[PDB]
Design an enzyme around this catalytic site. Structure first.
Site, PDB file in Angstrom:
ATOM      1  N   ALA A  93       0.867  -1.172   0.000  1.00  0.00           N
ATOM      2  CA  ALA A  93       0.000   0.000   0.000  1.00  0.00           C
ATOM      3  C   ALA A  93       0.902   1.220   0.000  1.00  0.00           C
ATOM      4  CB  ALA A  93      -0.890   0.014   1.221  1.00  0.00           C
ATOM      5  N   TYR A 101      -3.432   5.031  -0.192  1.00  0.00           N
ATOM      6  CA  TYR A 101      -3.910   3.633  -0.087  1.00  0.00           C
ATOM      7  C   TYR A 101      -3.765   2.991   1.280  1.00  0.00           C
ATOM      8  CZ  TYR A 101      -5.374   2.658  -4.862  1.00  0.00           C
ATOM      9  OH  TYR A 101      -6.099   2.609  -6.034  1.00  0.00           O
ATOM     10  N   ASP A 153      -6.822  -3.464  -1.514  1.00  0.00           N
ATOM     11  CA  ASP A 153      -8.198  -2.948  -1.554  1.00  0.00           C
ATOM     12  C   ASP A 153      -9.252  -4.049  -1.490  1.00  0.00           C
ATOM     13  OD1 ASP A 153      -7.309  -3.618  -4.091  1.00  0.00           O
ATOM     14  OD2 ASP A 153      -8.489  -2.076  -5.089  1.00  0.00           O
ATOM     15  N   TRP A 168     -16.044 -12.510 -14.234  1.00  0.00           N
ATOM     16  CA  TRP A 168     -16.017 -13.282 -15.455  1.00  0.00           C
ATOM     17  C   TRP A 168     -16.145 -14.801 -15.288  1.00  0.00           C
ATOM     18  CZ3 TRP A 168     -16.320 -10.366 -19.766  1.00  0.00           C
ATOM     19  CH2 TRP A 168     -15.973  -9.018 -19.651  1.00  0.00           C
ATOM     20  N   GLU A 191      -2.438  -7.440 -14.482  1.00  0.00           N
ATOM     21  CA  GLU A 191      -3.471  -8.461 -14.577  1.00  0.00           C
ATOM     22  C   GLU A 191      -3.482  -9.199 -15.918  1.00  0.00           C
ATOM     23  OE1 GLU A 191      -8.240  -8.223 -14.219  1.00  0.00           O
ATOM     24  OE2 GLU A 191      -6.946  -8.702 -12.482  1.00  0.00           O
TER      25      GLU A 191
END
EC number: 2.4.1.87
Length: 277
Positions: free
Chosen positions: A54, A58, A146, A169, A236
């Site tokens: 973080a 954050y 998060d 998904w 990702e």
């Protein structure tokens, strides 16, 4: 040894994809006998560790709730080691950890370049895996901050290399996965190819493995910077090409990473960790 059959009963969840097209478990609620596993891993005297980063805003927003919740829910009843990477240790909340929980913190050079952020993530993780984590733990988990642990997220999730089915998904058909679709990128996955759309917000395995995930991703990411190209969904998208080429050995269902925004269908039986608001 310890057979799959010994703790995994995919037949307890017919409704969903419990075994991948490569004989690897996808862990859903009800399929796992954590009690069996806990005993089994405890005998091996394993320590799981978990790496959370973080930076700046954050921290004050998430790092606490995340730890708190991890402290309460992540691998209960095994030594766990929180690898907390922050940009300013002052803001780092030193909240009271339970039994079998310990942490160590690290100052990192902060972000800020849109995809240096999660390019550093990968370098540092691996840098650490090599530097100490590999001696410190038997399994490593790296998660985004998060999110918050909602229920027991336990050794049933432990595996050689562990991906997280991305919550939005899981029920979708690959050719609609926001994979990276540009042949020009290191993250290129063509249509037709792909088994699941994995979530970057959690991944782990043995540190040997996680090293190798973070590395290849890093090499991917870097490649795509030198070729003047942002990937559609960032680290990702690499995390994903990766798990395409090196199939995960265990997949965690959306129960382990649920976005409540989606709602909460009959497939989501007991949410282990939810995304933040």
């Amino acid at each position: 040894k310890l057979k799959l059959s010994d703790w995994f009963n995919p037949f307890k969840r017919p409704e969903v994809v419990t075994m991948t097209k490569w004989k690897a478990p996808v862990v859903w609620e009800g399929t796992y006998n954590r009690a069996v596993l806990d005993n089994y891993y405890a005998k091996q005297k394993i320590t799981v560790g978990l790496t959370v980063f973080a930076v700046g805003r954050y921290i004050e927003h998430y790092l606490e709730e995340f730890l708190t919740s991890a402290n309460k829910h992540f691998m209960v009843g095994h030594p766990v080691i929180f690898y907390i990477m922050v940009d300013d240790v002052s803001r780092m909340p030193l909240i009271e950890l339970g039994p079998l929980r310990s942490f160590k913190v690290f100052k990192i050079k902060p972000e800020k370049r849109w995809q240096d952020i999660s390019m550093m993530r990968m370098k540092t993780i691996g840098e650490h895996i090599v530097a100490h984590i590999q001696h410190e733990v038997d399994f490593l988990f790296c998660m985004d901050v998060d999110q918050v642990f909602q229920d027991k997220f336990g050794v049933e999730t432990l595996g050689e290399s562990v991906a997280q089915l991305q919550a939005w998904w899981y029920k979708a058909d690959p050719n609609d996965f926001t994979y990276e679709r540009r042949k020009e990128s290191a993250a290129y996955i063509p249509f037709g190819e792909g088994d699941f759309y994995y979530h970057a917000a959690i991944f782990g395995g043995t540190p040997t493995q996680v090293l190798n995930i973070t590395q290849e991703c890093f090499k991917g990411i870097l490649k795509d910077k030198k070729n003047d190209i942002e990937a559609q969904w960032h680290d990702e998208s690499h995390l994903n090409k990766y798990f395409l080429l090196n199939k995960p050995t265990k997949i965690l269902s959306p129960e382990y990473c649920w976005d409540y925004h989606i709602g909460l269908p009959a497939d989501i039986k007991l949410v282990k960790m939810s995304w933040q608001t």
